[PDB]
Design a binder for this molecule. Sequence first.
Ligand SMILES: Cc1cc(F)c(NC(=O)NCCC(C)(C)C)cc1Nc1ccc2ncn(C)c(=O)c2c1F
Ligand SMILES: Cc1cc(F)c(NC(=O)NCCC(C)(C)C)cc1Nc1ccc2ncn(C)c(=O)c2c1F
Ligand SMILES: Cc1cc(F)c(NC(=O)NCCC(C)(C)C)cc1Nc1ccc2ncn(C)c(=O)c2c1F
Ligand SMILES: Cc1cc(F)c(NC(=O)NCCC(C)(C)C)cc1Nc1ccc2ncn(C)c(=O)c2c1F
Ligand SMILES: [Cl-]
Ligand SMILES: [Cl-]
Lengths: 262, 264, 271, 267
Amino acid sequence: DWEIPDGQITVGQRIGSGSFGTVYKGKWHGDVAVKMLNVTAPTPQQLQAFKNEVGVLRKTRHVNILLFMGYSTKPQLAIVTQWCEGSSLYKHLHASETKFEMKKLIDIARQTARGMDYLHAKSIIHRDLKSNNIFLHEDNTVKIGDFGLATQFEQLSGSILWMAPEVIRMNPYSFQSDVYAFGIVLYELMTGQLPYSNINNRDQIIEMVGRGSLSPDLSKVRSNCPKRMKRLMAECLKKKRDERPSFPRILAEIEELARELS
Amino acid sequence: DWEIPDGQITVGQRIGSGSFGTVYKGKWHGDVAVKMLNVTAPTPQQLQAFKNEVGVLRKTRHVNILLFMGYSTKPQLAIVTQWCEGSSLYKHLHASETKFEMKKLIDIARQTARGMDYLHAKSIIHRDLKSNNIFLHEDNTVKIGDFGLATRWSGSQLSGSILWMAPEVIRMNPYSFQSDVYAFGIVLYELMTGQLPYSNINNRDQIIEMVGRGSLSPDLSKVRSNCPKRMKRLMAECLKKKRDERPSFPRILAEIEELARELS
Amino acid sequence: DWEIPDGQITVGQRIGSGSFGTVYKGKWHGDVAVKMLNVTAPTPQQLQAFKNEVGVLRKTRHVNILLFMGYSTKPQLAIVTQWCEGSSLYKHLHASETKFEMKKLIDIARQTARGMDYLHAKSIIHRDLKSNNIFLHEDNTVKIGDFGLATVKSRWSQFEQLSGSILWMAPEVIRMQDSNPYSFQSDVYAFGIVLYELMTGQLPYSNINNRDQIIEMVGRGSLSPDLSKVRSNCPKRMKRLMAECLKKKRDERPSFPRILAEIEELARELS
Amino acid sequence: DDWEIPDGQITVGQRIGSGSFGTVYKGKWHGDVAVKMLNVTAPTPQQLQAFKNEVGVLRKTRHVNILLFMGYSTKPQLAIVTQWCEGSSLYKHLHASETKFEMKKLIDIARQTARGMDYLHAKSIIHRDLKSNNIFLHEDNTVKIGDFGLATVKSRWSGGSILWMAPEVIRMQDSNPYSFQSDVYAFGIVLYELMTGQLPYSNINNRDQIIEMVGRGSLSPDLSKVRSNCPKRMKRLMAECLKKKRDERPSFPRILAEIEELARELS
Ligand SMILES: Cc1cc(F)c(NC(=O)NCCC(C)(C)C)cc1Nc1ccc2ncn(C)c(=O)c2c1F
Ligand SMILES: Cc1cc(F)c(NC(=O)NCCC(C)(C)C)cc1Nc1ccc2ncn(C)c(=O)c2c1F
Ligand SMILES: Cc1cc(F)c(NC(=O)NCCC(C)(C)C)cc1Nc1ccc2ncn(C)c(=O)c2c1F
Ligand SMILES: Cc1cc(F)c(NC(=O)NCCC(C)(C)C)cc1Nc1ccc2ncn(C)c(=O)c2c1F
Ligand SMILES: [Cl-]
Ligand SMILES: [Cl-]
């Protein structure tokens, strides 16, 4: 049983708010993170969403998935996980002067494929893989999770740059849409930028990716990116979702080309 | 401006039994209803949801739309509307031995068509029209609103309202004017049969699967014998599985107003 | 009248849970089971399903149908039945080392035929017959019921919400086109699949991991249970009856009066 | 080369327009400016990229007929600062105002627009949304090309540029729908606006029907509606820019030279 009685967790610094609750740093046999609701009486809908999310996290035991640790129901619904140290992959790639050697970029790709392969073997669809939901714990261990937090206008836009054509169209989410999103993560790692950086108008992106043949410009991958990795990325990015590989092949392929580098 | 200064609204008894309810009877220049986010500090998303709803409500002025009256921010986020007297249409039809005359049932359908026609003219989608969201104020005026309302206003799970969801909504632009027309069609079915559809299918998952695949639709032979022919035709029109075969509310309103005149 | 006043039932151990309801073991003049809605203000479909379920159970009196005993209104809607001792046929056959002798396998088929024959004579379509809804009470009496508790879909997860019923759905129900395909005949097909579990000891399509392949191929008619898997001592009358119940064209399946007479006659023949 | 404006220097004034994520204000910074400010909580990776890419394109432009980029800010919020344009857009003048334009003025409006589009293309910049709403008539004598749109996301509870969109942009079936040639087409619709005073397909408004028929080539602008005193070389130029086959469209060096040469002939 993973319920944590009231009075044990010392809630500390507020990190941000998402669509569920508010994430804090806390103390419980060390450092933890607490995502908790604002209400003392949750609706049946909030309680269902809470049981769903505890339900999926309780099914995961893998070094590359954010470690679930427990939950509270009083005074508020709360999900307790390990505390991740460092920054998301997004901040490293796109919002800092962190320079990664290609060996480390491959290693990050390999660890992300391990976590995704694990989730899919459990028939878990992440639905929003992107470099912002990849945390580089201790600068050495990928942790896949849901790390999106708002620390005037409301954010209305989805993760359009990682959405497969069939998703950006609109059961669109599937294992194959997670694979496509992983392909865009490979693009981030291997080019150092986001796709479609010359197209400011998001409607044009939506229109061209979902209807036409707009796809990331693979000529921007760094010269030292292994050919096998470039080829794998293109497979993950196929428009027809049934031509994309599955994560057992993706993992096997990344582990094998990485060993070629050593 | 519609902001109400602190300490003007007196809050009273919460409406409902569940301790998660948000609606209270209150006093502000008379009776009011107050929908309150009871938290010590709202999140940004809660702040935005509160502003999204007030933003839609303040664009409505119509006798058949719940009257928005103001909002407050301290001590909590609170939306203030008129206080409605009486019961929802769901309670009259399904939770009480209220029996309506056909004339009264047509009048309820007509007034609900006026409010829906007004909303669509303002390009507002209700997204959850059902007999629970139709209030019979003073037993003479339909008010359309949110009267369960623990759910919806995030700019951006099938846990309820499935009986009013169009095939294309269950499938998954799912919400549209045309899905509002479908839900209105089910409301007509409630008015004209006295009952909810699919009364013999306990399993909610089989309803969901069958309705979305076009293999299940309301049994229209259950409409009562004095329901006007034109009203039955209109109902089948509003319930078409292909959303584009459904009439728009201007037509719906005109046909109800005219078939009603043929019976007073 | 079958309403049970409040405070008479001592609700005990939680036994199972879904998003809307909870099953408990209880005390009410002996042991009972209690299915109780989670909320005090249910949705319009939950309230409608409660009334229809009480109204259907109220009309059943048969040793192979779960015994309805009463229902509650306060604090929450609850339906009260007998407490069944033991495990479902599914747990016995597929999640346990129970080995049934063929005579006992025939007997379970016989008792299930009796209860379905009775339901259909009351104009009751079960709609979800499968080995999980056949309770082996006291290890000697079949109790047909419907023990599922509905769950809302999670974000992280086709026919997904029905995934526990797919192996027992007739082709027309899998196709699910145009009109309601649930009927006395689709119940019969689900009985055919139960016969397959009993007589093979396994679920159909064990060789096929792809759930989407199963659905497509069953619905089209290019896939049906492998009847070569029946056990050596399965009587010829039973394997022939199974195949009748599994016919693809629903109008070609027999009805339960003939099903029950066939099983009862063939059971007599083995002493 | 730093165009970053320290915080506290700009005085943000009247709000001019809003979209779902951003807002344009009139401001004060060594005189009058316009300030486009990202006002969204938790800006997405794509919104942050578009802010950066727009500053990088604008910083490569110095031309009297291109909206003048002046600076950008990072604190407290991301903002792009430009000159303040005085007057109204070409769209407001033609379609929502009692403005009468001499045909001389209309040729000169098309001539300056061609100058700035020729400049943009020479710098390898595809505008991607040229329309009369994006042509500002600064002080009623100087065309300023810009992009004054602010992205909007339709709300869940509620149920554009298409008139200037080239057929291949509507179809999304050919490689690279947005190109120099799709900008030439849009310019052709701006020429049609100028020489007829009305928007195209004005008497055909069936909506998604118009879109479908323009994509498949079964509906094109009615060129018979050009004003009588419209030069023949301007009407044949407009018809060339409007060609369905993108490769038959002329480039702006030729477009500008044709307008240039024809505007001398009528003083
Ligand atoms: C608290 C919390 C509870 C949760 F339940 C989820 N949920 C979730 O991961 N779901 C996806 C699950 C699966 C991948 C299996 C689909 C996320 C989080 N967030 C979280 C956790 C640790 C953190 N440490 C440091 N910092 C700076 C953070 O911001 C931080 C953080 F935001
Ligand atoms: C308080 C309140 C505040 C709100 F903001 C909304 N919102 C809303 O209607 N939105 C839909 C908008 C649109 C139709 C335009 C789509 C609803 C309510 N509810 C309410 C109002 C009055 C009531 N009077 C009596 N009684 C017994 C009630 O229970 C009651 C009640 F529950
Ligand atoms: C409480 C309850 C009330 C109900 F109304 C239904 N309904 C139902 O069978 N409907 C089908 C009717 C018809 C066949 C005619 C179609 C089911 C149940 N469940 C139940 C009953 C007894 C149990 N004894 C032991 N154990 C371990 C259990 O788990 C258990 C259990 F889960
Ligand atoms: C502030 C701002 C900043 C920008 F960065 C862009 N961007 C942009 O033009 N990009 C296209 C670039 C290229 C042509 C090279 C492709 C636009 C604007 N808007 C703006 C500027 C000035 C204004 N003066 C008066 N009035 C009434 C206005 O409304 C007004 C206005 F809205
Ligand atoms: Cl994005
Ligand atoms: Cl419902």
